[PDB]
Design a binder for these strands. Structure first.
Ligand SMILES: Nc1ncnc2c1ncn2[C@@H]1O[C@H](CSCC[C@H](N)C(=O)O)[C@@H](O)[C@H]1O
Ligand SMILES: Nc1ncnc2c1ncn2[C@@H]1O[C@H](CSCC[C@H](N)C(=O)O)[C@@H](O)[C@H]1O
Lengths: 178, 285, 284, 193
DNA sequence: CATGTAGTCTAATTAGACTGCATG
DNA sequence: CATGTAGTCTAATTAGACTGCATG
């Protein structure tokens, strides 16, 4: 009803070009590389209430194994979580541009407490998000079969985003709009 | 006053149940010892030698947070992830983020779940072990995810073998100096079956591979028996590691199967040194 | 007055079962001279008895002059190989060829060790072999030893069938064998914790792994967490009556250890034959 | 020490001969009387000690393996072990001072291994006795001093195998082997004329 | 009527002698 | 620059059929 501006932490990913175009002295925190960030460094930066991370898309620009991004994401997410004495809302958001394999996917859903949802793009390109936000978990979306998802990944790996814009919309009502 | 209570233990990658063996010999009462392990040889040793006290829960990746919250609360959380993909002795190591290396994060995951979080100041202790001979970058990542710096303890100071290992944890007195005792066999000669003569006072680090007995790169045998040199027997390795002799004489295992279990486990007197301060916190016999 | 410690000659000693039984009856042993050539056998005895056994190698190398200087002896014990006597071997060569003729080395040294006529001092001997030998091989052993054997089956004081012939002159060799309160008469009592036995008694344990299997059809005698299994070395030692882990030496495989147990004596049987000796020689 | 006594107190030899009879050879050199006490037994399998003692005392125990032929129903080592067994039955008690002799003769049928169990059980190495122009040979174990001391013609082992190879390939020993029983004449009564 | 102090065969599977180099 | 909670490869050992039949 009466809301405050949002404070977003983002890893592995430049988000501000898509954030404020959805309607949000900048309150973003982007960290160059998180092998060296410790607990107090994360909370020395302002208390966030939506942490965000993601893997790079399907391009040969990987100094990391694919699961390095989630493990580091899971680590700093626990740093930014507020104690149960926090009355404001809090969410998180990690997603993979289909870099992870089946063995990496099972580990992802074990560490993130959630089964991911797949979003497609009608034209294609698809994307795989875990996050506690209640809207996308219950959002009516056109489902895809999982062998067509990597029949389309093999076709996208041979030739080697507004898809996230539809998902970040439900954060409208919890934080001041522009 | 309030009497102390029996300790409740979550043991990850339990192996041949070194942790429970040490807790019992320190006289610490154990109410429950829940172990995650998958090697059938490992489990058979633990079931037999502790007579069915251990609760085996299987693959560490099947243990969920709700299991942790109901099986608990836990007072002590111990583990030592596989090192075959971290130790530089393997030129085909897959690093920390792939292979059996990533199993470390299962320990990190469950350690966070067993923690008494904000508000609960009950005593809580944890211990993670791994090798020193790992990559520089993999060492810093383990300590970043565990948010603590390792203490290096070599079993050469309280046993007849070299074994340099890293220990992360919050046990009281972890860096406290290592102290020889009456029951510690410091010399190889005290570890040999009767009639066998030790060449040296120490042996090199014992691993699962049968070349660990040999004293050097130039192949070597550490024992004299009758009119020939000889290898160290697996029964003598048990005494070097500090286990009761014939501890692993179980289920028709060969000496290589048994050396495979020993060469992976903890040195008992090192663990005994680290667990000993727990006697003040929990009920003893 | 004064009993003296026992002086023993043990031919084809194996894993030193004779010395083990003498110690646990409490008989002080002056000398225990053993003839043996299996290096796994010699290692067990050397380790398990901390160097008390004097090993002298091949029984064929032992001369009468050796028996004179090593002696005198109060007890002569042995059990020569049976792989050329037992009918279970279709290629057996008989008593006079192969390893069968090693029996005559026992008969020879037994004579060499007997006290000269005119001496009254106690002198005891014991020779064991298998019941399942040819009828004429049994006759020839009895005529060379001038005694008929007693058949003792270990199934009355142990968890295993083991019908063996015993020649000798120990006091009461033919007396009824009674189970004592320390005998484990059923297979369950010899298993490690958490294991359940199907059968109460196992058939004869030979060196071969098939002998654990029950019947013409193979059969596993133990249940462990609803799964069938074979006997472990540890459990086989207790079936035989040895201390658990007695053969856990020299990195021996489970087949190598079974090879030693499969050739040896049932301990509670030997315990029953040696028990009246503690009146003839010094006690603990 | 097998001492010799004057001639009038020597007695007729009493012979236990096994596996082979030597009655036709002994009286040829005069050890027994003409016409009708040597004891000969072929199958010694169920011979017990009591049998031997009631068979009168013995002065000479003799055994021989069958000559190279089809006559060896038993394994060749059988003849030695049975000989050893019965020999100990026939020994006198170490009190009496009479001369007691024994001898085992091998007609070239025992192989290398059986020869070594032979010398181990009789506690002496054998002597080889030849015949000259190499007709025949025999190996002899015995406590008769003149056999183990006489210097026979040297016969290496490559010739003894050739003799046994074609003696078995073409087929009772000689009369020159009086030197096998000749040394016994001085100890027992000599019968001739 | 089953049994047996074994022995001979194989596939199957282990057991012993090699490669590899980052690290303190 | 000696060391090592290993892995790879191929002579060696081992499970599992079979063989055999005298003996009580
Ligand atoms: N996925 C998994 N879940 C549970 N345990 C596992 C596992 N993968 C490997 N392990 C076990 O983890 C152990 C690591 S070695 C640690 C042994 C133990 N510290 C001791 O003192 O004996 C091995 O025994 C291995 O069998
Ligand atoms: N020529 C020889 N000289 C001495 N011992 C021999 C031998 N040939 C075989 N042996 C040994 O004789 C033993 C016969 S089995 C007897 C074992 C013994 N009764 C026990 O209780 O263990 C075997 O262990 C074998 O190694």
């Amino acid at each position: 009803w009466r809301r405050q501006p949002v404070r977003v932490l983002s890893l592995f990913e430049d988000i501000k070009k898509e954030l404020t175009s959805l309607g949000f002295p900048g309150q973003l925190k982007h960290v160059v590389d998180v092998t060296d960030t410790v607990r107090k460094d994360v909370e020395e930066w302002g208390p966030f209430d939506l942490v965000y991370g993601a893997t790079p898309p399907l391009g040969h620009t990987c100094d990391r194994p694919p699961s390095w991004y989630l493990f580091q994401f899971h680590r700093l997410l626990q740093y930014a979580r507020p104690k149960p004495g926090s009355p404001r809302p809090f969410f998180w958001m990690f997603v993979d541009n289909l870099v992870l394999n089946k063995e990496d996917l099972d580990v992802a859903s074990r560490f993130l407490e959630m089964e991911p949802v797949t979003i497609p793009d009608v034209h294609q390109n698809a994307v795989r998000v875990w996050s506690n936000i209640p809207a996308i978990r219950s959002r009516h979306w056109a489902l895809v079969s999982e062998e067509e998802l990597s029949l389309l990944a093999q076709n996208k790996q041979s030739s080697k985003t507004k898809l996230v814009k539809n998902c970040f919309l439900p954060l409208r009502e919890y934080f001041k709009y522009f | 006053a309030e009497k102390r209570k029996p300790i409740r233990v979550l043991s990850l990658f339990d192996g041949i149940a070194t942790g429970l063996l040490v807790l019992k010999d320190l006289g610490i009462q154990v109410d429950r010892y829940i172990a995650s392990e998958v090697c059938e040889d490992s489990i058979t040793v633990g079931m037999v030698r502790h007579q069915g006290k251990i609760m085996y829960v299987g693959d560490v990746r099947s243990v969920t947070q709700k299991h942790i919250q109901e099986w608990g609360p836990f007072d002590l959380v111990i583990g030592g992830s596989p090192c075959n993909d971290l130790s530089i002795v393997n030129p085909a190591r897959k690093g920390l983020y792939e292979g059996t290396g990533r199993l470390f994060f299962e320990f990190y995951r469950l350690l966070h779940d067993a923690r008494p979080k904000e508000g609960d100041d009950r005593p809580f202790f944890w211990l993670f072990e791994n090798v020193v001979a790992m990559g520089v970058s993999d060492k810093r990542d383990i300590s970043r995810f565990l948010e603590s710096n390792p203490v290096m303890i070599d079993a050469k100071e309280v046993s007849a073998a070299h074994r340099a290992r890293y220990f992360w944890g919050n046990l009281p007195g972890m860096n406290r100096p290592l102290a020889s005792t009456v029951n510690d066999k410091l010399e190889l000669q005290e570890c040999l079956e009767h009639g066998r003569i030790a060449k040296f006072s120490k042996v090199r680090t014992i691993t699962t591979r049968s070349n660990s007995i040999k004293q050097g790169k130039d192949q070597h045998f550490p024992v004299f028996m009758n009119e020939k040199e000889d290898i160290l027997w697996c029964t003598e390795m048990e005494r070097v590691f500090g286990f009761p002799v014939h501890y692993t004489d179980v289920s028709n295992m060969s000496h290589l199967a048994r050396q495979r279990l020993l060469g992976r486990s903890w040195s008992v007197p090192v663990i005994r040194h680290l667990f000993a301060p727990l006697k003040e916190y929990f009920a003893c016999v």
